[PDB]
Symmetry: C2
Subunit: 607 residues, 2 copies
Amino acid sequence: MSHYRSNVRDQVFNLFEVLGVDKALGHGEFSDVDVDTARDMLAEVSRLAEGPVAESFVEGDRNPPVFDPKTHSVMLPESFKKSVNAMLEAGWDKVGIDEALGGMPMPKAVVWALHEHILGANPAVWMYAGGAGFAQILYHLGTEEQKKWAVLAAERGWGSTMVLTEPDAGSDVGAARTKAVQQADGSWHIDGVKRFITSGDSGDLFENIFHLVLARPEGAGPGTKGLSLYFVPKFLFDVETGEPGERNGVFVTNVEHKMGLKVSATCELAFGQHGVPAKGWLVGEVHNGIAQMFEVIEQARMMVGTKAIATLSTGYLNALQYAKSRVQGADLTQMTDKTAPRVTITHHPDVRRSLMTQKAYAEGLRALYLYTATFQDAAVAEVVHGVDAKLAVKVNDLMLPVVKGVGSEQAYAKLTESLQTLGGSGFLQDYPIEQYIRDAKIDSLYAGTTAIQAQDFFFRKIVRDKGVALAHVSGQIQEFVDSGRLKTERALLAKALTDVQGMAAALTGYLMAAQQDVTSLYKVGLGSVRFLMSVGDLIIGWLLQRQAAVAVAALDAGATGDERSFYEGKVAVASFFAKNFLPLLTSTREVIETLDNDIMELDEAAF
Amino acid sequence: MSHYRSNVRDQVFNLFEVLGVDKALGHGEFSDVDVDTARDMLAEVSRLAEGPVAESFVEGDRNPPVFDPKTHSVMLPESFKKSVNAMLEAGWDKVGIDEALGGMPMPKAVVWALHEHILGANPAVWMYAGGAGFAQILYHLGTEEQKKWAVLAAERGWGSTMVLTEPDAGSDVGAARTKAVQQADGSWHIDGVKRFITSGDSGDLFENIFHLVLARPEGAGPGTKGLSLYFVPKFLFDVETGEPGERNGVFVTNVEHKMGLKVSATCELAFGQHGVPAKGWLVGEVHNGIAQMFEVIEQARMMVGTKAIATLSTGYLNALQYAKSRVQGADLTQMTDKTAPRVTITHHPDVRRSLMTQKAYAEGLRALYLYTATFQDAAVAEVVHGVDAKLAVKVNDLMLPVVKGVGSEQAYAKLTESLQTLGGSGFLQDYPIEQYIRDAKIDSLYAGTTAIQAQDFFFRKIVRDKGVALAHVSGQIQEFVDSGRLKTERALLAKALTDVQGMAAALTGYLMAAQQDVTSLYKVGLGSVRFLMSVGDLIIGWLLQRQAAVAVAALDAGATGDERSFYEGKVAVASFFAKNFLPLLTSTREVIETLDNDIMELDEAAF
Ligand SMILES: CCCCCCCCCCCCCCCCCC(=O)SCCNC(=O)CCNC(=O)[C@H](O)C(C)(C)COP(=O)(O)OP(=O)(O)OC[C@H]1O[C@@H](n2cnc3c(N)ncnc32)[C@H](O)[C@@H]1OP(=O)(O)O
Ligand SMILES: CCCCCCCCCCCCCCCCCC(=O)SCCNC(=O)CCNC(=O)[C@H](O)C(C)(C)COP(=O)(O)OP(=O)(O)OC[C@H]1O[C@@H](n2cnc3c(N)ncnc32)[C@H](O)[C@@H]1OP(=O)(O)O
Ligand SMILES: Cc1cc2nc3c(=O)[nH]c(=O)nc-3n(C[C@H](O)[C@H](O)[C@H](O)COP(=O)(O)OP(=O)(O)OC[C@H]3O[C@@H](n4cnc5c(N)ncnc54)[C@H](O)[C@@H]3O)c2cc1C
Ligand SMILES: Cc1cc2nc3c(=O)[nH]c(=O)nc-3n(C[C@H](O)[C@H](O)[C@H](O)COP(=O)(O)OP(=O)(O)OC[C@H]3O[C@@H](n4cnc5c(N)ncnc54)[C@H](O)[C@@H]3O)c2cc1C
């Protein structure tokens, strides 16, 4: 087969044995979707991922897109084009999207499980083909006239981009200087240069591209609150039929050469700099740019974390496959006997430690993004968690920085173990883990760096939230921990919950203290990322133990064969994680409780 | 200037203010080298590394060597060949080499500090140019006839290789099947295929290459003990003048395609398979192969750890230079004020945490390999540490797994922080950190995987050694923590010593219990790598506090200006490491004390 190894069985286990998404199927907007329908779609898309989508994964990296400056055009490998069009011709880009746009209803938890397979097999495909998902947001936020455009965009299959960054405005989006001047007809003319734009051009892959652009109206206020969101197409088009017309003044002027994700054209995109106006329209005809754009960012941050996790999972499964078959060395128990038979390396304790660590974070993080996705539909959140719509929004907001920040960083860190499992062969392009690592590095940077995720998590999702969402998740873990074979694991989780609550209390103390000495805030920043990562380990631990309980019940009821091996692996991985990673949170709490500002007051030249 | 950023000042600090190498200079073999001569040499190689050597760093990766299968030859980029020849013409490969081979005396601590700059600027240069260091080993081990061959190899500038690995014999060197058949004329015919041979061919870069080859003499016993070391030249040569002659029967048949270190040709090397016998000569005319080859392996393991550390250093320095000039966002104390002045990112807490983390491991690991190198000369070890020659060998042996294993893994892990400091630009090939990471990942694999290092460290360097070397080093740390501003840090180091000593006790306990239940050994394997990493952190913490003590003295003695900034940085980094990384060892100890065999008993199919 291909490089991509899927795990539909684990997705089904989470969705329909552990998390309860099955109880929302057959109800609400999912009247005509049952568990069998969702299972079949998952198997169907996993086969597409493993075949036509994965087929161009290697070539996308080895023969990157070619950029021609004078026609401002990017040419993608033909094999990649077919991969994208194989996905689109099957309609996987439209599941969960409004029926007006050609979609059919589906819980986001299932949608993200479906898209996991695409993100694992060839993530850039998902990016180039996000047009309809972009159209969904434009449909939600636009005037009635702009809704017809969104409908057209979805059906003519346009490509799409999210356009915020400028050389001087990356983390600080509010510093952007791309400007917008209103025209007599109500149109606007966009004028500026944007940097690092994913899918900024894609050649003849699509009939059109509609950029969603942040720009500052002439005379607008400063910062992010002064930015407005604009619909700017590559081609002007017939507002009735969608037929592309005159080329609009939006041009790629450069394409970055990157560590990985090479098939995703990361572009310098110029608006109105080449003699042709960049005509655009104010989304919703209101000035509400940063709020509007964050509907896109929220999806971007979910995708990026799910991508990081999809990559770890297939990285782990490739390493496991290799390890079962690689003979090297003798069993440690027969070390003195140098004539002892050679064994497969899964017999070596460090290889099993490595593989169980990979397993725990692949499956642990899979559970985490699926659990997060059960809060992204109010109806699913209601039936699974018994929370009302407002609280579900708060919990999803709480969990997004965890999915993105912990997923990106832990996936990359544990792909190191995947590669280590192959020995020297892991350093070769013959195996895909090398590329997995290069493609995954980006996940801690774009859609907001980890430091921005951790700042958002504490200041916006806990402090501004008054801790409500965190107290809800904490309370669910408390109940789980207070409720035979899993008693030791639950006590380690009780300790980890207490450790994380002590982290949050210390950081809130630093926050409170800042009223007397404002530099106390630096301590919060110093601890923010370790706190973010600790919460992730806590929720991974809990979800894995919820899985282990379902597995114990399945084994007692007489599981046999492959199902028994699946459930046996869940008991072991939940216990392994509890004993090897949860106790580390104790030392981290002590460090966070002890933070000082020595390194803040240090002279910069001392570094 | 170039990508490579050096730190001569820190090397001097370690060598001549902390570690006491100055006491050995001016005496014994080092008559002709004083502190000043060494500082100038470090500065001189500093500049060669930054210029002619770093010149080809980028091209070597983006235009890798071309393999010609019909002539079994590798063609290296011309600019890279210039870099190698610039190193050789300045004689940096012969520093510390026997005078018979064109070298002059130099303590190993200074030699590795010299080579740090080549390894950071273009590590493959060091590898290709290592021929003279190979000859020194040939000179030590050879018959009188072979020592003349070693002289000619050093004088004619030949390249060299170390040839062990086969497809079925990587970590398990003893499974190699390359054969050796003695001829009437006293030579042997080598027959087999070797894999992954660094520098297996180099085109016209050198006049000859002498391969050091492990092979199994006809009728020898199994495992590493049945292997012998053979001298196998690319060209047969006149044994009096060294003039190359007939082509010997050893040919490269493939070159690997790798993640990084691309300009190092990693070759499939075939002996006696292309119709021409591969003539070789038994090194020392004795069958001591694995012990002889381990003289080479010990240098390779020191180099790999030093390379990884050299790479983290220039990664940190590049990120630091970038952080000081990158304007993004405002001070955290003004987060509510959206009009606040923009600041350089060095003002942000998470960036300073990141930078101080990179600093502590770059400088901590530099101290580690320099400390280790003070045991690689008997005269130096006596003057500096007061230990006899045989104990110095044992300590060096103890530390080689630390330098290679901990250096390789921690350098790669912390380069993630370096790249993160660049934000989105770190993912660009426009900056060198992307290449650092790819070039560094191999450090955890070749010259023995991290698991091999951890196994060697415990079973051979602690258990076979009867705790002598470990007891000596721990004794020095015990002394140190029992000796105002460094008091808090001293106590954290004491706790770390107790923690590591508890890890050792637990592992020794598991070893003893293997007398009754031999599976207990598996627990040793499970904790082996974490134990090794913990010792690294202990020794890093210790050395940084030794540096801090020296720095405090210099501060109170009236240091000013840039020297004051240097010394202040050492105080801060030693304290930061003590407070943020040493306490984490307590939880690691608890994990090691609670290891069990559940994941060993688990069915393979359950993974
Ligand atoms: C049915 C089907 C469904 C289909 C749809 C799904 C599919 C769609 C397809 C997805 C496409 C993905 C394509 C891939 C492209 C790659 C992504 C990128 O790199 S792209 C680029 C990625 N770039 C980045 O990620 C930017 C990174 N930088 C940051 O995030 C900064 O922290 C900053 C810019 C927010 C700071 O600015 P500063 O002015 O200090 O900010 P303040 O703190 O003052 O907040 C101001 C206002 O912002 C707002 N708002 C804020 N936070 C949140 C939130 N978390 N959350 C929400 N809103 C949030 C809020 O309105 C707030 O006002 P208020 O409510 O308070 O009144
Ligand atoms: C100015 C100078 C400028 C230029 C400088 C040039 C310097 C020189 C060249 C530098 C290198 C060039 C760069 C090349 C980079 C490629 C490096 C590689 O990958 S290639 C290398 C890649 N491949 C590897 O690294 C192999 C990795 N695999 C291993 O290490 C395995 O553990 C194994 C082979 C030892 C197992 O086999 P098994 O038979 O079960 O192991 P046992 O436990 O039973 O010991 C058997 C005998 O071996 C001995 N001996 C053992 N250990 C050590 C030691 N630490 N320590 C010492 N000796 C050791 C010992 O004699 C022992 O006998 P005994 O004393 O006990 O009676
Ligand atoms: C491959 C790729 C594709 C991209 N595609 C897109 C796209 O389609 N659309 C788009 O809009 N953007 C895109 N970007 C940009 C992306 O959104 C990133 O947010 C951007 O690269 C980050 O800003 P920067 O690179 O200027 O880094 P900076 O913001 O300059 O960050 C540099 C360092 O400073 C730290 N830092 C910065 N500000 C703070 C702060 N206030 N507190 C603490 N630490 C801070 C960061 O964490 C980081 O370590 C892409 C980037 C890449 C690499
Ligand atoms: C770039 C590069 C250059 C190289 N250059 C040279 C060279 O010049 N000369 C040379 O002789 N070799 C060279 N090698 C070979 C290199 O030393 C081997 O790849 C290395 O020893 C690992 O062997 P392997 O690839 O077969 O992995 P394996 O031995 O198959 O290891 C696979 C996995 O099993 C684990 N494992 C194996 N045995 C054990 C055990 N007993 N206990 C616990 N875990 C175990 C490993 O840690 C790893 O995770 C090079 C390799 C590379 C990648």
